[model samples]
Target: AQYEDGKQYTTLEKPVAGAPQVLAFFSFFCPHCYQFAEVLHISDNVKKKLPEGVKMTAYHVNFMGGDLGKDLTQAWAVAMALGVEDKVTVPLFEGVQKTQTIRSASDIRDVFINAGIKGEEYDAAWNSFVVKSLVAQQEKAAADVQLRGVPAMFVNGKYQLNPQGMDTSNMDVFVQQYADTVKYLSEK
Candidate 1:
């Protein structure tokens, strides 16, 4: 079924682009986001279901402001900058929220290290000016939505999925609804 506004999803002030872009807004510190990943098994399940002309991007939210919050956000932005987000995103989430292993910047960097990013390469990307700018952009987008929590999703910058409906047991229907909604919107 198509997602209805105020029910399955809501609309944004402006749509994203000509093509659909699925933005997954999450925070590594959020337990629900971690559980969201756990339920999906391979979080790529969302991507695998997407039609052509659709793109997916993950944004790390800053619900908690301070050192660790900034750190993890930067880590994610750097991973994207290095084009290694596909490799490090889920593992970083699992490492911090599931295994309880990653705590500091060093540990976060280790994720990239394990992904074959040399220590120097990790540092360069992590500290780059462009990385900081991207993080700022992601943070602004998160704030724009008045995002109070994690595991939230927006398609094409307009339709905001109802997070409460995306739990483990509700995933199949949630995915279908999302696909339906995206397809419906793209056609219009």
Candidate 2:
């Protein structure tokens, strides 16, 4: 069976130009986003199957926790800028969702510090132009898509995967189908 446009996915008005990309819009404050990243492990599984040259990227959206939402996005951008995303993503997720210890930017700094990133280094990145630009770009990307939900996946910046069309009860099948959908949309 073929995935149909408008049902399985929707095309964007302005296609983003870059290497074939799978961009996921999520919020650290979102429980489902946490489940998707940690429980389902969908990104890791899908990453292994993406067509060569296709890259998967995540953007923390600022629509979930009101004022704190932007702070989380900033912290995420800082982690990326400092090249400590691998170290802090899970910690941050656990802090927000499981431990409920992260409530402010200062709290996020503590997580970075605990991750072995020097406090000064975290501050430098937090205040750097690069992180600011990254946060802005992430916010813009979310706005560009008129995003209304967490864990939304888009391929080539145009085609959005429709979860309603996927069989999600079985994790293995869901991951494979998701990867296939991404592969199918990347060529467009």
Pairs in clash, predicted candidate 2: none
Estimate, for each residue in 153-172, the C-alpha lDDT of model 2 and write its tens digit. Answer: 98877788877788878987
lDDT by residue for model 1 over 1-188, one digit each (tens)? 44567766777766555422777788888877776666644246656666777777788887663577779999989888988877887788788777978878888988889988899998988778999898998888877666777777776767777645434466676656655554554434
lDDT of 1 at 5: 71
The most accurate candidate by lDDT is 2
> Runs in model 2 with CA error above 4 Å?
13-20
Q: Report every candidate's CA lDDT.
A: 0.73, 0.83
Clashing pairs in 1: none
Write down the RMSD of all candidates, one decimal each: 2.9, 1.9
